[PDB]
Amino acid sequence: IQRTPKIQVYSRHPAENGKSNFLNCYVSGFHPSDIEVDLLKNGERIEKVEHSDLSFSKDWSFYLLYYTEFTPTEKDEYACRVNHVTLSQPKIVKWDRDM
Amino acid sequence: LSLLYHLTAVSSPAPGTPAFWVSGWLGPQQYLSYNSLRGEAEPCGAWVWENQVSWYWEKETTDLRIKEKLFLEAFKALGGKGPYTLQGLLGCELGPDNTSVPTAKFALNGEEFMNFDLKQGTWGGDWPEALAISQRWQQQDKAANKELTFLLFSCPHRLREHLERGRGNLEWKEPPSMRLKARPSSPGFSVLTCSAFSFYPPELQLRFLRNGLAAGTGQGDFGPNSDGSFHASSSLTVKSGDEHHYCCIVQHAGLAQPLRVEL
DSSP states (O other): OOOOEEEEESSOOOOOOOSSSHHHEEEEEEBBSOOOOEEEETTEOSSSSSSSOOOEOSOEEEEEEEEEEOOOOOSEEEEEEEOOTTTSSSEEHHHHHHH | OOEEEEEEEEEEEEEESSEEEEEEEETTEEEEEOSSSSSSEEGGGGGGSSSOOTTHHHHHHHHHHHHHHHHHHHHHHHOSOOOOOEEEEEEEEEETTEEEEEEEEEEEEEEEEEEEOOOSSSOOOOTHHHHHHHHHHHTTTTTHHHIIIIIIIIIIHHHHHOOOOOOHTTTTOEEEEEEEEEEEEEEEEEEEEEEEEHHHHHHHEEEEETEEEEEOOEEEEEEOOSSOOOOEEEEEEEETTTTTGEEEEETTTTOOOOEEEEO
């Protein structure tokens, strides 16, 4: 069957406007495994952006972390857009800070 | 401890994309990685630096390779234009009396349908496309065999050899970094959100106090960082203004007591 992604977006460490960090956008619940996931600084997708291997939970639902290094100053607003056969257009998940 | 492999083939990989791939999990730790545009099984994270029985990967590899041929061939055994998605959950847990309990189930586009029965030494399940793949693999030379070897030897041998060689890894305790922040609800309301960063193992408990007395765990949410440490958070609705009376309590292996997190 088809299963629609849950999307979350968090840094590795506590957000501190100034020091080097790591932004994670994690997607988990979906099926089929086909998926495009991208990390926006302010509006534009980011260039150097890794993504771990793809696995699946105890009910075959795939899950997939994308991530990237970064540094936030209360200028920028980083966020996570995700498209998949089940979402109707992208969902963007604004990275709410210290959460 | 369980050693489990997650196995995945799709009929139509999107361009530049592994038609097959596997990851190997020592518990909630990912030790092995294998796509199909490399045909090479490789260690991940800490498990790279493990001194191993060395000729250990060339059996992981040949194993996984042989497993991929069969996977991409289950597709041929199949009805239509599809496209399909076929999944493996294969491994074994070790338990208190020098024992292994082997595991072998498969699913079809997120739906469970095949299982390897080991008394009968086979690939069962009565719903149609089961029969189908069972039988291609059934009538396929000593593959049924090659599995048992996998499931009763290779797996327990592997798992026992991680337990001895990277035991220390298995028991890494990293305490979470805490933060309690407040954002606004409907006027008259606000939400507290206790956020826990980094942290491994995964077990972790959060909760809320208003002046010391328990005032709910919250809505909670969970996921991975990329070093394979973890992230957690719980949010709770509170009467706007009541705010500073509250605090968050975290309970985690890396900690000696529990810990208070003031706003």
